[PDB]
Amino acid sequence: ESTSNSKNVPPDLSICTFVLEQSLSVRALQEMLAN
Amino acid sequence: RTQTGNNTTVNIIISTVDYLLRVQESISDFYWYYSGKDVIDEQGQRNFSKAIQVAKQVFNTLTEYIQGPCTGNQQSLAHSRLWDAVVGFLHVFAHMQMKLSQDSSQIELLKELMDLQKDMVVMLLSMLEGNVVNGTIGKQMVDMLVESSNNVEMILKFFDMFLKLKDLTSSDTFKEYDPDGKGVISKRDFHKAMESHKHYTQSETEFLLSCAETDENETLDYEEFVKRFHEPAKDIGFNVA
């Protein structure tokens, strides 16, 4: 979605917003995947 | 900290803090590699011992930097990334202490780890030097404790559950089960003592039974058990208190 042309064309950020749910280390994530 | 006369200044204190942070990550990765494995091999024990020695030396150097209320160094550490390293070491201690105590072959490693914890708490106490009531450094350490609440909880449970042992075994209620002076109490009499004290819950009961190694006669020596576990608790837990 173009954001530089905000003056001419409104961006649609409702479908661009994301939420950062969990941040885990690589080894902890590997153990969780093993589980 | 700051070489005033020289044209260029290098922050040795911040460099030491960075090296501590790298050593913490290395130790955490090694712990994660031994997380699943029930037993630690001798080479792994040696590597843990060497890493613990290095971390202990770095902790002592950092403590010496900030003792003698060196306010500039204290502020530098407060605004540096020492807190993340302390949080990591707290998790390492809380999990490793539970893991190592169950087996009777890593008692020396447990002692080294607890000595490292003692030095870390000494560094924190040196950090708290000169703090006024409602001080910013005290606030930051409370924030760090809240961030690492679970590890602190498990460490405190560990200290509680290995400090009540001396009172339990010194109580006469424990003495009726073994009236004679041999002191070699059976596992089942141990188990009834667990519930006669009534402070030791079922989880504490099972964990101490697991951490107590017995002969083929199902009879443990409470004397060697207590001299193995209680005395180190009385030594390290004082700094936490």
Q: SS in 3 state form for chain B?
A: CCCCCCCCCCCHHHHHHHHHHHHHHHHHHHHHHCCCCCCCCHHHHHHHHHHHHHHHHHHHHHHHHHCCCCHHHHHHHHHCCHHHHHHHHHHHHHHHHHHHHHCCCCHHHHHHHHHHHHHHHHHHHHHCCCCCCCCHHHHHHHHHHHHCHHHHHHHHHHHHHHHHHHHHHHCHHHHHHCCCCCCEEEHHHHHHHHHHHCCCCHHHHHHHHHHCCCCCCCEEEHHHHHHHHHHHHHHHHHHHC
CA–CA gap between residue B8 and residue B13 (Å, rounded): 15
Of residues B121, B122, B92, the one with CA closest to residue B109? B92
Of residues B222, B157, B170, the one with CA closest to residue B197? B170
Question: What residues of chain B lie within 8 A of the CB of A35, using their CB?
Answer: none
Question: What residues of chain A lie within 8 A of the CB of B35, using their CB?
Answer: 27, 31
CA–CA gap between residue B116 and residue B136 (Å, rounded): 26
Extract the tokens encoding B15. 């460099």
Q: After which residues is chain A broken (C to N over 2.5 A)?
A: none
Of residues B139, B61, B124, B62, the one with CA closest to residue B93? B124
Of residues B101, B93, B239, B89, the one with CA closest to residue B165? B101
Question: What residues of chain A lie within 8 A of the CB of B29, using their CB?
Answer: 27
CB of B197 closer than 8 Å to CB of B205? no
Question: What residues of chain B lie within 8 A of the CB of A28, using their CB?
Answer: 32
For residue B102, give how far its alpha carbon lies from the nearest alpha carbon of chain A (Å).
22
Residue A31: C-alpha distances to residues A24, B53, B90, B102 (Å): 11, 28, 20, 22
CA–CA gap between residue B92 and residue B48 (Å, rounded): 12
CB of B219 closer than 8 Å to CB of B187? yes
A31/B36 CB distance under 8 A: yes
B25 touches chain A (CB under 8 A): no
Extract the tokens encoding B126. 């040196």
Biggest CA–CA distance in chain B, Å, is: 77
Of residues B216, B214, B171, the one with CA closest to residue B194? B171
Q: After which residues is chain B broken (C to N over 2.5 A)?
A: none
Contacts of B163 (CB under 8 A, 6+ apart): B230, B233, B234, B237
Contacts of B45 (CB under 8 A, 6+ apart): B106, B108, B109
How many angstroms separate the first and last alpha carbons of chain B? Answer: 32
CA–CA gap between residue B137 and residue B127 (Å, rounded): 8
| B35 to chain A: closest CA residue | A31
CA–CA gap between residue B185 and residue B225 (Å, rounded): 11
In which element (H, E) is residue A27 found?
Answer: helix A26-34
- Return the residue matching tokens 């479908």: A15
For residue A27, give how far its alpha carbon lies from the nearest alpha carbon of chain B (Å).
7
CA–CA gap between residue B69 and residue B103 (Å, rounded): 42
Biggest CA–CA distance in chain A, Å, is: 51
Region for residue B134 given its phi and psi (left: phi exceeds 0; alpha: psi -120 to 50; beta: otherwise): left
